[PDB]
CSV table of N, CA and C in Angstrom, one decimal:
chain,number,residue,atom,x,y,z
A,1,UNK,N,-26.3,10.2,-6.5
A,1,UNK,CA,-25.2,9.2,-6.5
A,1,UNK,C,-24.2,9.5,-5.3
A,2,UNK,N,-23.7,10.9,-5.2
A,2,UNK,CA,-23.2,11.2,-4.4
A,2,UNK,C,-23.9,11.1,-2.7
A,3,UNK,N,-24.7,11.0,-2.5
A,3,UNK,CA,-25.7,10.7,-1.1
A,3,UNK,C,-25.7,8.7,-1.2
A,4,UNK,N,-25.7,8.4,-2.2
A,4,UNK,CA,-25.4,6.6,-2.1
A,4,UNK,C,-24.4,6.5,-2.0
A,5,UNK,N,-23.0,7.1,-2.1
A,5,UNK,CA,-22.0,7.2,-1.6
A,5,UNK,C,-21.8,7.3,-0.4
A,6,UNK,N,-22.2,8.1,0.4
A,6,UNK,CA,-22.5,9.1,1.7
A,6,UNK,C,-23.2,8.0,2.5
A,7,UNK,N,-24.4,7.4,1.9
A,7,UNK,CA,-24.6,6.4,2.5
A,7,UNK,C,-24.2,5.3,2.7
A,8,UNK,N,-23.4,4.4,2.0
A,8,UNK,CA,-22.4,3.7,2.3
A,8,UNK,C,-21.0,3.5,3.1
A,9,UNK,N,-20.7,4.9,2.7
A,9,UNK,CA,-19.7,5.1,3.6
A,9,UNK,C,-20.0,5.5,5.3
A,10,UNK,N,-21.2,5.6,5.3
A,10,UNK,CA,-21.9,5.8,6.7
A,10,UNK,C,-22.1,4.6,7.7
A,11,UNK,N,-22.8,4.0,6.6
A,11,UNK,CA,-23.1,2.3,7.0
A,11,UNK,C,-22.1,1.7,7.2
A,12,UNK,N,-20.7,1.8,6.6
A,12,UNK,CA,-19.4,0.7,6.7
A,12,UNK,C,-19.0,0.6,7.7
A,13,UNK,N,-19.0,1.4,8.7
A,13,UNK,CA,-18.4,0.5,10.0
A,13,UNK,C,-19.3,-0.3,11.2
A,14,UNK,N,-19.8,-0.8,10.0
A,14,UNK,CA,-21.0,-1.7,10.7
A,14,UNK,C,-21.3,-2.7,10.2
A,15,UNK,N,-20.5,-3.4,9.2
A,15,UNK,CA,-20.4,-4.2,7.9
A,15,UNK,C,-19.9,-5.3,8.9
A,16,UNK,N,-20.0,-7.1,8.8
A,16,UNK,CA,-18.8,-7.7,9.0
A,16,UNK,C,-17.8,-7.9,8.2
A,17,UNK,N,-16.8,-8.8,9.0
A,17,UNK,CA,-15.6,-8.8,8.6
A,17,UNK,C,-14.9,-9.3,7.2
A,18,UNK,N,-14.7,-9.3,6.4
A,18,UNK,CA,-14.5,-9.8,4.9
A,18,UNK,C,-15.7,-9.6,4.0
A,19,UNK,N,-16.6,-8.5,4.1
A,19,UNK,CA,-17.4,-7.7,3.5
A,19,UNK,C,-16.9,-6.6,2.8
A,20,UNK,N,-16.9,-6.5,1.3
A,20,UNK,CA,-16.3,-4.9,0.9
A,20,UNK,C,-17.7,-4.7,0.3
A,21,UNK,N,-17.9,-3.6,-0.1
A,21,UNK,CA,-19.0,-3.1,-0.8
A,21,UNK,C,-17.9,-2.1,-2.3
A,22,UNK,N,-18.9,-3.1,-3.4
A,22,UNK,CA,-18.2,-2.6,-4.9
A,22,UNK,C,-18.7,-1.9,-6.0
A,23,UNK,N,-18.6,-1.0,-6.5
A,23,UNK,CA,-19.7,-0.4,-7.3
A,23,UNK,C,-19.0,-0.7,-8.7
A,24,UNK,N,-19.2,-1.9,-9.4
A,24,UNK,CA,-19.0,-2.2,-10.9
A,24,UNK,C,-19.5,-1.4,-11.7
A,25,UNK,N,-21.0,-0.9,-12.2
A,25,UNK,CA,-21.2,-0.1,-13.1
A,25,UNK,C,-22.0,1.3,-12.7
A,26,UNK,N,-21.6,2.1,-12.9
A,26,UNK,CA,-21.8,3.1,-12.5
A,26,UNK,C,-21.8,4.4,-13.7
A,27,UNK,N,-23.2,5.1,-14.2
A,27,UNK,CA,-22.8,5.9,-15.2
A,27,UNK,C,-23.0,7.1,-14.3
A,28,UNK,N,-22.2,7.4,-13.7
A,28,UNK,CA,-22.1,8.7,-13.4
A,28,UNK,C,-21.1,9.5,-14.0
A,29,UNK,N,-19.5,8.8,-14.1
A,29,UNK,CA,-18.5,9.4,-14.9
A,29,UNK,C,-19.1,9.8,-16.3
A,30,UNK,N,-19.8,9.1,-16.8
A,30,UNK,CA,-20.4,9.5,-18.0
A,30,UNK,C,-21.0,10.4,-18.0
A,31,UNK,N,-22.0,11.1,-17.4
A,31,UNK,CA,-23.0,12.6,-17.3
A,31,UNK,C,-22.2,13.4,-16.6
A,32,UNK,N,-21.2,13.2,-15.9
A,32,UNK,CA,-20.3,14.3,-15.1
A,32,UNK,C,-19.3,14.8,-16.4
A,33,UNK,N,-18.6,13.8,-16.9
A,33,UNK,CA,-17.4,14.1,-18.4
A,33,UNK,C,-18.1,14.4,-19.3
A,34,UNK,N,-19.7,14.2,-19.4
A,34,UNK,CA,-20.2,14.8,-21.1
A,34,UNK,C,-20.8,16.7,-20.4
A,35,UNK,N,-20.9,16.7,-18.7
A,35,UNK,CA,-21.5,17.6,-18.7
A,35,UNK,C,-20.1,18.8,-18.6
A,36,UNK,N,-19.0,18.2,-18.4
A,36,UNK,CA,-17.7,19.0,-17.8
A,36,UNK,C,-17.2,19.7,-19.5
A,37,UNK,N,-17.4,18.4,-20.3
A,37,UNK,CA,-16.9,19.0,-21.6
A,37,UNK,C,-17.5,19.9,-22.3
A,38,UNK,N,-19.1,20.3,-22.3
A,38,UNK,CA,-19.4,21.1,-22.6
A,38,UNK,C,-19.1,22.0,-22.1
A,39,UNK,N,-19.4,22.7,-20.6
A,39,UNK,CA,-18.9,23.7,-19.7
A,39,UNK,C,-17.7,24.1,-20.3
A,40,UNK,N,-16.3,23.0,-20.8
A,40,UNK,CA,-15.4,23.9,-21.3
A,40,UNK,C,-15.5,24.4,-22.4
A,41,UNK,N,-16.2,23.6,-23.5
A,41,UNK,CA,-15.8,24.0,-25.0
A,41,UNK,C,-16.7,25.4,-24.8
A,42,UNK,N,-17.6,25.3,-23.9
A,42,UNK,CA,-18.6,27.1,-23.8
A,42,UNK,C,-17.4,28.3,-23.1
A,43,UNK,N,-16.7,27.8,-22.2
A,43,UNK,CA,-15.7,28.6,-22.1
A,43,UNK,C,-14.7,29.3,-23.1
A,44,UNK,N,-14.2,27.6,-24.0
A,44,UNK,CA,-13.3,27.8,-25.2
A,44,UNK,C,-13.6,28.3,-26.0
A,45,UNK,N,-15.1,28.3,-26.3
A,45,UNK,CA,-15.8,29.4,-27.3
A,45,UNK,C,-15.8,30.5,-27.2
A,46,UNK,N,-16.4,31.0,-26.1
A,46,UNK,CA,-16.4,32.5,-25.7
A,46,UNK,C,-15.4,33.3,-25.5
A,47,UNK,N,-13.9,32.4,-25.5
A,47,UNK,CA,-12.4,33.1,-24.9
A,47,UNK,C,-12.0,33.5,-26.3
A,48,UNK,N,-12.8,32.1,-27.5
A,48,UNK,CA,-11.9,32.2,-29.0
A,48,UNK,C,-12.4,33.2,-29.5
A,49,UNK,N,-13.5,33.4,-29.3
A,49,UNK,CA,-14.6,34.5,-30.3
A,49,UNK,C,-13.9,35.6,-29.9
A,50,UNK,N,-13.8,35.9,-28.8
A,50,UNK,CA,-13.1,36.8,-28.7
A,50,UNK,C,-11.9,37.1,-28.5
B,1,UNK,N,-23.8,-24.8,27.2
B,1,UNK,CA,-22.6,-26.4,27.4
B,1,UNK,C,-22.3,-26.1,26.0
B,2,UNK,N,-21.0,-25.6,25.9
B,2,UNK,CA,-20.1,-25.3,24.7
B,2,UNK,C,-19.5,-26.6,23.9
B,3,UNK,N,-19.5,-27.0,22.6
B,3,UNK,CA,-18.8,-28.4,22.4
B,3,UNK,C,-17.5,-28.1,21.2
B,4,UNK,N,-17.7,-27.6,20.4
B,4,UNK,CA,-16.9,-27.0,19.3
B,4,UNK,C,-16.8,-25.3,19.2
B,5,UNK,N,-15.1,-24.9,18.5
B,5,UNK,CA,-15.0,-23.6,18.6
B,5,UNK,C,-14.6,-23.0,19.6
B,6,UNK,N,-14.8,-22.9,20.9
B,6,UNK,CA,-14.4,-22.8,22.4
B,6,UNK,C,-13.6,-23.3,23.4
B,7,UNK,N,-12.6,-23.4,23.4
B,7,UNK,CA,-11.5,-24.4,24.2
B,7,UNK,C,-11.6,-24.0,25.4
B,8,UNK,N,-10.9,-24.2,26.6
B,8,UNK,CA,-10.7,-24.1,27.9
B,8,UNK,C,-9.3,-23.1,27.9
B,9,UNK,N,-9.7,-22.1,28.8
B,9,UNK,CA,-8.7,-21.3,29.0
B,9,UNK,C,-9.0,-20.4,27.6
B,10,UNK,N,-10.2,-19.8,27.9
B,10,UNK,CA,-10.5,-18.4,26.5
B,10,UNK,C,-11.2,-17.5,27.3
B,11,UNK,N,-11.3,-16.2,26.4
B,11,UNK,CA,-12.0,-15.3,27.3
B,11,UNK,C,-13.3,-15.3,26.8
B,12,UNK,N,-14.4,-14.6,27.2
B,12,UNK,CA,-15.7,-14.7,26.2
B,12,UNK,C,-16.1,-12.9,27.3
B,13,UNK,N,-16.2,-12.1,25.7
B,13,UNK,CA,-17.3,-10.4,26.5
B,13,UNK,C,-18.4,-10.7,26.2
B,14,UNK,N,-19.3,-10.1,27.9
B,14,UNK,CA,-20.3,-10.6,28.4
B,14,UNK,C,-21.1,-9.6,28.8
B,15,UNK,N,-20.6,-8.2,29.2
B,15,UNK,CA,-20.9,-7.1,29.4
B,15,UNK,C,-20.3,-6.0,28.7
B,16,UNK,N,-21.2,-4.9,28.1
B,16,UNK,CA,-20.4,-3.6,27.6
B,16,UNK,C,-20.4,-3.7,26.1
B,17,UNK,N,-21.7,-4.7,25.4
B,17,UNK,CA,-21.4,-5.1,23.8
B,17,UNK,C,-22.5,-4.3,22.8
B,18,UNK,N,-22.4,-3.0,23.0
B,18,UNK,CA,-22.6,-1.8,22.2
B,18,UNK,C,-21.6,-1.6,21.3
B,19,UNK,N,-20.6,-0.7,21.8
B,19,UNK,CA,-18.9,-0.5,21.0
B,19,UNK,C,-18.2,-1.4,20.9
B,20,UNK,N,-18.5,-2.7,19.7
B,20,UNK,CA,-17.7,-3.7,19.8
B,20,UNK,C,-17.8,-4.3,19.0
B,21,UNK,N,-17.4,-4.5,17.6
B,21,UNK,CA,-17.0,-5.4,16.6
B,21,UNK,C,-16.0,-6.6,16.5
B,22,UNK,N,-16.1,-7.2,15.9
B,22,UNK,CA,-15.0,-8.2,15.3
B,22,UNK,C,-13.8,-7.5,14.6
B,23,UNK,N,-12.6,-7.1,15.2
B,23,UNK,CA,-11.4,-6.4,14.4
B,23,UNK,C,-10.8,-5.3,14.8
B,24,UNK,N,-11.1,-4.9,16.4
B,24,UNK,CA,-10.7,-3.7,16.9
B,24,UNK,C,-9.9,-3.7,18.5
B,25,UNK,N,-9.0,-3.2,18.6
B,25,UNK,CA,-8.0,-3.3,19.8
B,25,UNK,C,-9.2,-3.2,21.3
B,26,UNK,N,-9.9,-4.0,22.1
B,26,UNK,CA,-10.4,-3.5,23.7
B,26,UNK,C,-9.9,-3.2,24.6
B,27,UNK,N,-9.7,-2.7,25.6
B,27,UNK,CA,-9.6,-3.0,26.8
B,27,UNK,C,-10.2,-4.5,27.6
B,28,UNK,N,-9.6,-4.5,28.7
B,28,UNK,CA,-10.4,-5.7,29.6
B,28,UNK,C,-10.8,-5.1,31.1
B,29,UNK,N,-11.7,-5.6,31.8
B,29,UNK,CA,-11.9,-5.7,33.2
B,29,UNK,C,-12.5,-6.6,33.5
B,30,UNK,N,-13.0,-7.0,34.6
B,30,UNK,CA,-13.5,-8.4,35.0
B,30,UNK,C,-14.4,-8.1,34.9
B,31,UNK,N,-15.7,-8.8,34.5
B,31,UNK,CA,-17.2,-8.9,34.4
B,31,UNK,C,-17.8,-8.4,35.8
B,32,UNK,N,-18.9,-7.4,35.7
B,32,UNK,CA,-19.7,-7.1,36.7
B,32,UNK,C,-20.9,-8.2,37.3
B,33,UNK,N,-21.5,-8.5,36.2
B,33,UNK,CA,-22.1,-9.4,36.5
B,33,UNK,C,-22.3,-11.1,36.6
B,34,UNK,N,-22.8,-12.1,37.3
B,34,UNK,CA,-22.0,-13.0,37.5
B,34,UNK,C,-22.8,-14.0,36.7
């Protein structure tokens, strides 16, 4: 997702004029925030147990 | 033979149209070629 990004923003100054490029749905926040919350509560676990 | 869009007394780039979009400050010099 991030390289479709990369690519886009590569290609834009080569767009015409009154062209934006818009990404409406997008689940990436979704697998980045389910994978970040786990990472922590495995942190908050390991800190509580002990 | 131009009819609409083009008035008399405009410029038109004719040479040099690699680096050059619609929306960006140029330079000018007179046309090399005729």
């Amino acid at each position: 997702a991030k390289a479709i990004r990369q690519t886009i923003a590569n290609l834009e100054p080569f767009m015409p004029q009154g062209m934006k490029v818009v990404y409406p749905y997008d689940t990436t926040p979704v697998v980045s925030a389910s994978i970040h919350e786990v990472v922590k509560t495995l942190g908050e676990a390991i800190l509580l147990v002990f | 033979l131009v009819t609409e869009g083009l008035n008399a007394g405009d410029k038109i780039i004719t040479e040099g149209l690699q680096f050059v979009q619609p929306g960006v400050e140029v330079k000018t010099v007179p046309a090399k070629n005729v």
